[PDB]
Structure formats: structure tokens, C-alpha cells
Subunit: 311 residues, 5 copies
């Protein structure tokens, strides 16, 4: 229970694979997701080599404690993975085949710039630290990388699960570490956002614009202030499903812009009333008639500009 | 502590059974449920054969570490099950009878299309992977599949708990896997939705239609905008109890449609005021009188169409 | 470490007791409660008998691993109990006295029909499964059933903690099972519901009835619609503290009924305005004056009927 | 291992001490708090005595499994404490000095009568049960009772951490039990309640009283009903931070009383409008002018009475 | 497995290092954060010294149970850290190099005075208690203190991770204790607060000031009372993201001040209506015209004063 000795001076290659069984709990605010998968490991340990003829077997099954196993860890996990060894098999030439089933909570940053029309690349970083005896390097066995067809992540479409085959080798506390990047590509199912948030938010805004066909200040004040309050409710609802970002987001940009439209509508309603009281309704009529065209036109142009800047 | 040897070349059959003791925490948003049950396992291990005359006893009792036990796992769990072995009984021929009590979280997708008048089939998948010495296959002992009479899932009716007797045998990462599908059929108790959400939502909508018997624009604006805000509160309440779906739901369809009715009622109230101010009340009167019939009639027809498309 | 052998063919009687130390976290929505208690067990093991005059020792203290202990479990628990053995004492005749302190999360259905004036019977079901060597039956030692005087369940009065002395003996998966029912009787402290929910809800309803002393349609619309919105807020608040039931609760019935009163008040306010506009105020005056008496009278009678149907 | 034998017939005295390292998560609704502390224990075990000269050591260190250690438990904990033994030192006469660091979630009832100007005495109850061989009694070593200077409980001032030196000795399940009461005295930091809840609540109430300087019924209805809704929001906010109590609380009393003031203000606004419509404004003017003085005066007197009854 | 003996009388120096791998869950209300890191320890044990010439090995690898390891703990953790030993290496002179990967929930108070433009110094306190055989003192190996480049704390900028090299040596329960202070300096990303909370809050306040260009009391009452309610919603939203502090926060001060502006605006709207009704509109006009300048000017000056007092 020391590492396999090198024949010359070569690093020990540990072949890896991850096969996804379950994907769940993608938490946008926490920027975490839970995973249940198979982790497969393979390496050459000559001390375990045997003759098939003499032994009368083509495979040898060991218990984890009986042999040397590389200390493989995940970089971006909350706590160490919950793992259960499934099988350890040794071929006559000492080729070890290790299989474990694990569950882990993974930290992986999300880009919310295009929310809710966003795509993400979730990462699972595999790592191994070298020992004083020898250097350990990781490799990808593409034959053992995959996912169950039933793997579903509520509210998302799973595109692919692949591995960057070339490890990132680097020094950490005067020892070599070898890191692999497993990538889960997902795209958000934006469907439900349209009848639940986007269209209700547009309906209340268009309702505030009916004030441009009314001379009644008291009815106008009621129309614009009431719909503004409903917009505040939606702003609060949206920001509870999202983390605080150093950058602007598409939904955040639209929500912010709609406040400007409420603010300018209040100015218009105030200006209209003021002129009416001052016995200059001809003026007030010109501003109100212009507003009927200006507000939807500027709203459409501003949305085209925003969609262009974000997509 | 290697698998039982084959007399010829056949696979080792592991007979299974699940007996439900408790069902709790059906989380609609998470699409999970918690289960507390008996897991029974049975297989022949002739290496454990004994003479009752020599050993004195008619049945031998073993500790899990003393004998070979098949590595049975659940596919769709969050974490590995919490299990406590209740008994391991070995009969003279070598037939093992294994009993454990376990608790587990189960991932099982839910179809919300007909919510809150929906039924679900929850799944518990049992799996075993084959070893090199021999192939292991799962079977259902129907005599050991069941549920306690007191098993209750708050807000649901439990219909049945059965197993698909034919396992799904397939290759996974160059070894055989034998999978069993245990199905828990449940139907939602829709009762409470009627006095708590459906009737309050209808009352506020009918209250907005009183604007069709009023010429007072300022009272009308108050009626339609205030009831709209109450509808937004209900929309938010409903969407918090449900996950985001790539498809429309019945409740979601009705909630969305009721916005259209509020939006068209605002148009009517605006059109009515505009004509009144323009000294054309005869027109306004014709539109308002038509609206008194059109709004409830189109609401009833649209609901018949929706109920038909969903049920 | 096999069960004690029978002198004739009799079942092994395991005397039980539960002494409550702490009661906490009664979750109405989850229908669970947490418990911290002593579990006492007593049975005869003749293999462990000793001479009192020869040994000098009146009692012998064993470690759990040194002797046979019955596998006692709880039926209605989320997960297996967290237990710590306190003492194991053997008397000369071989009578074993076992004591453990445990904590567990218990599933126990609640009847919300009379909420918040409801009483509940929480259950803790003890169970033992018979072995092939012999049948194990449970009994209650009333001397070892009780609760600490300081045991408090926030928002509830603890009435009694008793056990149904006769076990439920039945066959489960071809073996005998012996089940005991420990009952914790509690009654809800309804006090706080009166100044926090009931009286505020009545105040807003009575405020809507001031519309029956007003001819101002615009003020009336404001009175009835605003108070209705406040009632919706209370409806939502109440239903968050309760699970969804396939029956009406007492509070649910009152909350539902108050909607009818708001709906009929809107009809009255509409009818009054319509007649006034139609130059028939004498009529409107008769309906409004009748409403001043009818609304409080029908509200009182409907509440007497509801209280009678529920209590 | 067995308890230390008595020289005569005396009970074994176990000297105790608790040194607080961290205090966190005081949950008002749950009436729990989390603690991280040192637990020190000391007792004489003659069997472990040694001569310093022939040993060459003035102190002897032991592993917990090597010697007898009293089974000390906490009464008012959710689950058994998470403990790690730090040191076990034996002096020549066999005086054992035990030290462990533990973490526990403690149940301790809170008196909310004077909230948010309340003080609490949190308890940590230490207990030991007697064995058949001998009686075990607890004592306090005041030299080993204390707290780290950095111990902070968010939202509270920590006054003292002391122990009631005389244990409560009593019989439980036919064995004697020795209980110690460790008391943590804390006082609530009421500061934030003034600008966040108290003053905003007073501002909206005073805003409703502007209706006593207005003859406009429509504006008055808007003033009193809108501010009432804001008061309902604060009532809901406050009751979410508190458990349901069988007794009234100070904040609860004020919140309830403010509803009466809203209810009576609506009566006044109604009475004023009714008289105005009946062509008796002289009367209405007398009631409104009286209300301008009566409402603030009765509000001040009622608050003096409440503060007196509660403090 | 006793501590290394001193050559003279010197304390044992344990060199420490923490290398951050993950930072997550900075909870403002709980004043906690979770950390995943490497903990490195180094000390001399002469009993483990060997000859490198005759051994042919430069380093010897040990299992934690095979050698003496100092009991290092964290002061400000909720529960004991979850640790996994990575490596133990011994140099020929007997210098031990210990490496573990751990995860822990850390308690560290936060200063909210300047929120959301605040910076924090999070602490991780390392501690060791001296043994009876010898005094243990901690030191910092700056070569083994650091953080992964990918370390991200959502909503924060990570400035530095350093250690105070001089330990705090002190007596605690009649033994020496050696404490090290590891400091993680972070600054809040205030960006999102501007379009989500600050600007919406300013827009509603400016909307209330349009009442200074209106003579309509009923419209004015609607403007000031409706926006006040929206301000209450924001006050509640902000105080849910923050703990209760015995001091004013910057945001808390602004939120409180904005209430005064609403309260004085209601006084103005009331005074204006009263004078008009009293047939003194010339006066009312002078107060309203002054208010148009006074309200924005006093708001700007008060904000300059507040920003100055807090920054
Ligand atoms: C209020 C404004 C309403 C929002 C308007 C749509 C947003 C948008 O412009 O959405 C665009 C995204 C498409 O994104 P994509 O192909 O993934 O991006 C990759 C883009 N590159 C690689 C070319 C840069 O979604 C859609 O298919 C639009 C369907 C939603 C309709 C909403 C109706 C209301
Ligand atoms: C606002 C709209 C009101 C909702 C209207 C009822 C919806 C519906 O039509 O519901 C229908 C479902 C029945 O469902 P089923 O037999 O499970 O479906 C399987 C059907 N197949 C297999 C034939 C396709 O529920 C009910 O029994 C309706 C009773 C509730 C009445 C609510 C009154 C308010
Ligand atoms: C608005 C509606 C106001 C609520 C009216 C009280 C409901 C009720 O009638 O409550 C009745 C329950 C009594 O229950 P019991 O004797 O345990 O039931 C056993 C009944 N048998 C005989 C069928 C077995 O509570 C009370 O003692 C009411 C005291 C509180 C009054 C609250 C006033 C506000
Ligand atoms: C609306 C009503 C506003 C609340 C009025 C203060 C309540 C009170 O009078 O509070 C009193 C407590 C003091 O309590 P004590 O000394 O701990 O109690 C022990 C009392 N004995 C003598 C019975 C043992 O708080 C204070 O220091 C008051 C400061 C808060 C001012 C809030 C201004 C608004
Ligand atoms: C409503 C009032 C609007 C808020 C005004 C900004 C607050 C402030 O005055 O912010 C000042 C802080 C700077 O902080 P600093 O350098 O970290 O502090 C260390 C200070 N010393 C020298 C005392 C140690 O932030 C900013 O850079 C302001 C950018 C945000 C502008 C928001 C505009 C809306
Ligand atoms: Cl890991
Ligand atoms: Cl499993
Ligand atoms: Cl159990
Ligand atoms: Cl304990
Ligand atoms: Cl620690
Ligand atoms: Na190994
Ligand atoms: Na086995
Ligand atoms: Na045993
Ligand atoms: Na011991
Ligand atoms: Na050690
Ligand atoms: Na109004």
C-alpha cells in the first residue's frame, strides 16, 4: 500500500471516466447542482500481475483496503463526495479497473447575462496530487464518459457531457497536481417565462398607456401608480430567483427600463393636468396625442437595441 | 465472499420485494418523495448448505459481513439509501433470505399538464450489476411486494404499488446491469383548490365585470385595476407551488387567459370613456351592453375549449 | 447472541416503556414532530441467570455487544432513531433491564377539521419482528411510561402520554410482527388566533359594510374592493400554515364564506348605483336599508350554522 | 470497565464545568440556540492511582476506552451532543481530569411578554444517572465555568454565564438522577425595532388622522383604508418572527390596539359623511374637531396604560 | 503516540498553512461562510529521524494512526471540520509534513454600517492546547498560505487571504493555548443595488413630489399614500437580507429618512387642502411653490450629510 514503482522515471497515468446517473437541484442563486454518477479509474500496478494458467483465473477481484488506490478528488465540491466502491478488477498484466458510484454537490459559476434565454457549461474538475515516490497524471477514457438517457435537469435541456482530454498539470505546494475538466452543457427552457412573467408585465405596462386617451387626472394617477406597484411586485419576484451580479442582465435591463417608462408616464400625466388647470388644453392635447405614438415606438426601439446588445 | 458458483452457466437470480412502511414529503417543485420500506432479497448460495442434524438448527442466521450479499442499488435516489439489516436467514439447501429496512429520497419526474386534477406514477428503480465470475439478474417475488394500510401521502390518494416483473437487462460500461421498475400510482386530492384558489379567483374576475353596469370611468378604472392586482397575487401564489415546465399546464392556461379578460376589460372601459367624452354615448352604450353578454359567454366557451384540450 | 430459548413453546415477552424528555417541532404542514425520550426494554434470558448468594453481586452490567438484544423499531419514523444505550442490568433469574436514550422524527397524521380549536392524538408505534427460533411479543410496563414535567410543545397543551397495553399482533411477509401504540394527546392553544387573525379579519369585513351608509359609488367601490384585497392577504397567510386537506377546515369554511359576503356587497353597491343612475333612488334606498340589517344578521346566522356543523 | 468502588458508602462526585467558545442561531420561533463549548469533568478513581517516584511521571494520560468515564448527558438538547475528547489526565491519587469540546442545539423556552424589550435566561441542563454499584452526584467547579470574550449572539447582549451549584437530585425510572442548571443570561438589542417597525407604524397611523382635517369622504376612505392595509403588512411581518403564545405580548398588544384606532377612525369618517349628506354639517364639524384631540390623547393614554401593565 | 520530547525545555512549534480551494455561502443574516481548503501542518519529531544514505529513501510515508499528530482545531466553527488526510511525509531529520483537505462552516461577525458599500475581514482562527508533557505553539509558513485563482464568493470581490504571523498565546482552563488569525478580506459588489433597489426607491419618491404641481386633494392623497406603500415594500425587502444591528446601517438611515419625506409631504397635501377649503388659496399656493424647491433641496443636503457621516 505504496504507489506502483516506475519501470524507468515515468509518471503514473490514471485513466478516468464519469457516467452520469442523476442530475438534480440546479440552484441558480447558490450556483450549485447535485450529481449522482459512476467514477471509473484505471492504472497499471505491476506488483499485482499474475499468470492466468498458474492462477486458473483471467481476473482478480480485490477489496479497496487490500491494494493501492489513487487519492482522486473533486476540486469544485462543497464537501467530499459520498462514494461506494462497486468493483475492483485486476487483469494478468496488473491493469486495475476501479468503479465507484458517488453523489456530490458541485460549485459551478453561471453566466446570467442572457437570462432566461441562457446556456451554461457546468464543470466537474477531477484532481490527483503526486506522491514523493512518483508523479501521477490523469487521462480520459472516452469509452467510459457518458450519461443515462433518463438524466433530466428540471427547467433545462441537457446538450452534452464531454471531457477536455488534456489535463491541466501544475505545481501546488511544491507537488505536481493533475486536473481534468468534465463539462455538462445545458440550455434553459425559457417557455414558462413568457405566459407567467413577460406577457403579464407587458399587459400592465400597456394598461398604464390607456392614460394617454384620458383627460381625467384622478383616473390617470390611479392607472399609472397602480400598474407601477404591480411592476414592483414582478421586479421583486424575478430578483428572488437570481443572485446579485456585477453585470447587467437582459431581464434586469428590461425590468429597469420599464421603470423609466412609468416615470416618464407620470411626468406626462402631471404636465397634462397642470396645463388643463392653467387653461391651456390645446397644448396638453398635443403632448398627449404625441405620447400615444412616442411611448409604444420608443418602447419597441429600446427593446430592439437591448436584444441586439445582449444577443 | 465471492459470488455463488453456477451449477451450469446460468445467471444468478436475486428475488426482490419492496414493502412500503411510510411515504412522505412529495415535493412537486423538486419532483422527489421520501420512502421508508422493507427491501427483501433472496438467492441460492450452495456454499452455505448445511445438515440440520449436524448443526442442530433448521435455519442459520448470519451477519452481512460473514457471507456474500449482492450489491443491490437504487438508480433514481439522491443519496445512497439508509439501510439497517433486519435478518439474514439461510436454509439447508443454501437459500438465503435477506431483509433490510431502508429510507431513501427518490427522484421521479411529475407530469403537471392536468394540475391540480393530475395523477402520477412514481418509480423506484432497483439495480444490480454483473460481476466477472457471473451474471446477476433480478426477479420480483410478488408475495413480498406491498404496502402498510396506514401509508398516507398528504394531499394524495394512493392507488397501487406494483412491480414490472420483467427486468430491463442492458450493457453499461462493458458489464451487464439488471433493472427492476417498482411503481407507486397516486392521484391528487384537488378538493382544497376549489374554495382556496379557483372560486376566489372567479369572484374577483366577476367583480371586474360590474364595470359593464357603470358609466363612472374613475370607479371602473378602480374596479378593473384592483381586481387585476389580486389576480397577479394568485398567479404568484400558484407558480411558487409548481416547477417551471416546458409545456403549458391547465391551471397555467386558465391563469394566463384571465389576464386577457382583464386586458380586454381595460380596453372596453377606455373605449367607453373616450366615446362619452367625444359626445357619442349611444355607441359607448352599445359596446357596454354587448360586453355584459360577450365577457361571461366567451369566458365559458374558452374554459370548455381548455377543459377539452387538457382532459 | 441468538434469542433466549423457550422453556415450552411460549413467545418471548419484551416489556417496553417510553419516557418523554423533550417534545419539539410539531410541523402542521409536514404532519411530523420530533421526540427525545428514554426507551426501556425488559425480557427474561435464562442463559444469563446466576446465583445471588454465591456471586455476591445482585446485578450484572453487560455491554450491548456481549448479549442478545431484541431488534425493536419504530414504524412511523422518517429515519431510524438516534440511540445511545444508557444501561443494561441482569437480575439473578436472568431478567434483563435495558435502557436507551433516543431522538426521532415521527410521522403522525393530524385532523385539521376544527382548526384552530383542534385536539390531536400523536402516535409512536413500537414494533418487533419474530425470529425463526421464536416469536417475540411486546408488552407495556406502565411503571416505565411517562413524561418530564418541563415537556412543552410550543402552541400546544400536553394532556396525556399513555400506551394501548394490548399489542397488534399480525403476519407480515411470512413472520409474526408485534406492534404497540403510544399516544400523546395534545390540544391547540387557540388564544393568539383571536387578536392576530380572527378580529383583524372581522374589522375589515365590518369596514366594507359602511358602504351601506354611503350613496357615493366611487367611495363604495374603494371600500369593498380594498377590504377584499386585505381578506385575500389573510386567506394566503392562513393556507401557508396548513396542509391541503380533502375536507373543509372550520377556518377554511369561514374564510370562504367571507368571500361570498364581499361578492354580494359588490352586487349591492352595483345595484344601488345602477338604480340611482336610472333615476330610481327610492328603490336603491330600500335595498341599502335592508342590507344594513340583512348582512350582519345573515353573517351571524351562517356562523352559528358553521360552528354547529363543526363542533 | 465499571464505576470506581466506594471506600465507605459515599456517592461518586463528578465535578463539572462548561466554558463557552461560541453562541449562535438563537431561533425565537423554535426557542432553540446552538452552542460550542468545553465540557470539563473531574472525579476520583482509586484503581488508577500511582506512585510518582517509581513511575517517573507526575501525570498519566489515558484514551477514553482505557478507563471508566461517567455517562454525562444534556437534558434539553435536540440530539446528543457532538463531542471530541481533548484530554484525560490522571494525578497520583487517581484524580481524573477530563476535557471535551462539544457542539449542541439546546431547547430553552423564551418569555416574549416584553418583546422587543425582553431579557432571557437560557438553560443548559447537565445530567448523570446512578448505577447499581453506586450513586453518582454532580458538582460545579466554578474555576472551570466561563466564556470566551469574543462570544457574541447576533441581536443580543450576553450578561452572564453561571451555574446553580446545588444539583437537583431525584428518582427517574427507579434510579437516582443528578441534574445541574447552567444559566446564560441575555438581553435583546431592541435598537433596530425603532427605525424599522415602531416609527414606520406610527407614521402611517398619524397619516390616517389627517382625515380629521378633511371633509372629502372619498379622500378620507382612501387615507384610512390604505394605511390600514400597510398596518396589516406590519402585523404579518412581526408575527412571522415570533411563536404563537398563550399570553399577550407587548408588541402584540400595541399592534392589536392600533386596529381599534383604524376601526374607530372609519366609524368617524362614515358618521361625518352621513351627517354632511343629511344636511347636518354643524354636528359633523363638532365630532371631527373633537376627534382631532380625542384620537392622539386616547392613543397616548392607552400606550401609558399598556407600558405600565407590561413593565 | 505521545508528543515529541523536548531536547531542552522549548515549546513544540507547529507550522501551519491554509490554502483556499472553495469559498461559498456567505450568509449575511447568519454571519457565516463555508470554506473548502488545504490545512498543512509541520513539526519536528526526532523519534522519526532516519539515515538517508543507508535507507536509500529521502522520505517515509506514514498513516495518521502510526504517528503522533497535534490536535489542531478551529475556534469559530459551527461543528468540527470534515477532514481527509492527503499525505504525511517524514524527512531524514524527523520533520513531519502533514496535509489534509477540509470543509467547515465558519462564524465570523460582519460590519453592516456601510452596506451595500461595505468591506469585510472574515476570520479563520486556528488553535492548539498544550499537553502536560509539553507546550505547543503555532507558527505560519507563508509558503503554504494562499488561494486558488478560481475562488469566487458570489456578490463579493476577494481582496486577500493572509495570516497574522504572531500567535495569541494565553491560558485557558489551566493550560496554554496558541491561536492564529487567518484573514480573508472581501468587498461587496454594490452594482446590482443601483438598478434593483436604489433607483426604483428614488423614482417612487420623486413621483410623490408631483403632488406639489396638483391642487386635486383626492389625486394628491392617492399619489403620496400609494408610493408610501411601495416604499414600505422596499423597506421590508431590504431588512429581510440583513440581520438586526445595534447600530444604524447606511441604507437603514436613508430608508428611515425617506419616511420623514413621505410624512412631511402628507402634512403639506393636508395643509394645502385645508387652506383652499377655508378660501385662502393664495397661502396654499405659497406653501406648495416653496415645497417644489424645499423637498428636493433638503433631500439632497440630508443625503450629503448622511454620506459624510458614514464614509
Ligand atoms: C419584453 C421583451 C420580450 C422578450 C423578447 C425575446 C428575447 C430575445 O431576443 O430572445 C432571443 C432568444 C434566442 O437566443 P439564442 O439563439 O439562445 O442565443 C444565441 C445567440 N447568438 C449566438 C447568435 C449570439 O430566444 C428566443 O428564441 C425568443 C423567443 C421568446 C419570445 C418572447 C415573446 C414575448
Ligand atoms: C375556472 C375553471 C374551473 C375548473 C373546472 C373543472 C376542471 C375539469 O374539467 O376537471 C375534470 C377533472 C376530472 O379528471 P379525471 O377523471 O382525473 O381525468 C381523466 C379524464 N379522461 C381519462 C377521460 C381523459 O376533475 C373534476 O372531477 C372536476 C370537479 C371540480 C369542479 C370545479 C368547480 C369550480
Ligand atoms: C368568527 C368566528 C369566531 C369563532 C367562534 C368559536 C368557535 C367555536 O365554537 O369553538 C368551540 C370550541 C370548543 O371545543 P370542544 O369543547 O373541545 O369540542 C368538543 C365538541 N363536542 C361536544 C362535539 C365533542 O372552542 C371554544 O371553547 C371557543 C372559545 C373561543 C371563542 C372565540 C371567539 C372569537
Ligand atoms: C408605540 C410605543 C413605543 C414603545 C415605547 C417604549 C417601551 C418601553 O417603555 O420600554 C421599556 C424598556 C426598558 O426595560 P427594562 O429596564 O429592561 O425592564 C425592566 C423593568 N422593571 C423595572 C419592571 C424590572 O425599554 C427602553 O429602554 C425604552 C426605550 C425605547 C424608546 C422607544 C421610543 C419609540
Ligand atoms: C440615495 C443616496 C444614493 C447613494 C449615494 C452613494 C453612496 C456613497 O456615498 O458611496 C461612497 C462609496 C465609496 O466607498 P469606499 O471607498 O469603499 O469607502 C472607504 C471610505 N473611507 C475613505 C472613509 C475609508 O461608494 C461609491 O463609490 C459610490 C458609487 C455608487 C453611486 C450610487 C448613485 C445612486
Ligand atoms: Cl471528492
Ligand atoms: Cl441505494
Ligand atoms: Cl427506529
Ligand atoms: Cl448529550
Ligand atoms: Cl475543528
Ligand atoms: Na488504498
Ligand atoms: Na458481502
Ligand atoms: Na446484541
Ligand atoms: Na469508558
Ligand atoms: Na495520531
Ligand atoms: Na382612489
Amino acid at each position: 500500500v505504496s504507489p506502483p514503482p516506475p519501470i524507468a522515471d515515468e509518471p503514473l497515468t490514471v485513466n478516468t471516466g464519469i457516467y452520469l446517473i442523476e442530475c438534480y437541484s440546479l440552484d441558480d442563486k447558490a450556483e450549485t447542482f447535485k450529481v449522482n454518477a459512476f467514477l471509473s479509474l484505471s492504472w497499471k500496478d505491476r506488483r499485482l500481475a499474475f499468470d492466468p494458467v498458474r492462477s486458473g483465473v483471467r481476473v482478480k477481484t480485490y477489496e479497496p483496503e487490500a491494494i493501492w488506490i489513487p487519492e482522486i478528488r473533486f476540486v469544485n465540491v462543497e464537501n467530499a463526495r459520498d462514494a461506494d466502491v462497486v468493483d475492483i478488477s485486476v487483469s494478468p498484466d496488473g491493469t486495475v479497473q476501479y468503479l465507484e458510484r458517488f453523489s456530490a454537490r458541485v460549485l459551478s459559476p453561471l453566466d446570467f447575462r442572457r437570462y432566461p434565454f441562457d446556456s451554461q457549461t457546468l464543470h466537474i474538475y477531477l484532481i490527483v496530487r503526486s506522491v514523493d515516490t512518483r508523479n501521477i497524471v490523469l487521462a480520459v477514457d472516452l469509452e467510459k464518459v457518458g450519461k443515462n438517457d433518463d438524466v433530466f435537469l428540471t427547467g433545462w435541456d441537457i446538450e452534452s457531457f464531454t471531457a477536455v482530454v488534456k489535463p491541466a498539470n501544475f505545481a501546488l505546494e511544491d507537488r505536481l497536481e493533475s486536473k481534468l475538466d468534465y463539462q455538462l452543457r445545458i440550455s434553459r427552457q425559457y417557455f414558462s417565462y413568457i405566459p407567467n412573467i413577460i406577457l403579464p408585465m407587458l399587459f400592465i405596462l400597456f394598461i398604464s398607456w390607456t392614460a394617454f386617451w384620458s383627460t381625467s387626472y384622478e383616473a390617470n394617477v390611479t392607472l399609472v401608480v397602480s400598474t407601477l406597484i404591480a411592476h414592483i411586485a414582478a421586479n421583486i419576484l424575478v430578483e428572488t430567483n437570481l443572485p446579485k451580479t456585477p453585470y447587467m442582465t437582459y431581464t434586469g435591463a428590461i425590468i429597469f427600463m420599464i421603470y423609466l417608462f412609468y416615470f416618464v408616464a407620470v411626468i406626462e400625466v402631471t404636465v397634462q393636468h397642470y396645463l388643463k388647470v392653467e387653461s391651456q388644453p390645446a397644448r396638453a392635447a398635443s403632448i398627449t396625442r404625441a405620447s400615444r405614438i412616442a411611448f409604444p415606438v420608443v418602447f419597441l426601439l429600446a427593446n430592439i437595441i437591448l436584444a441586439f446588445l445582449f444577443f
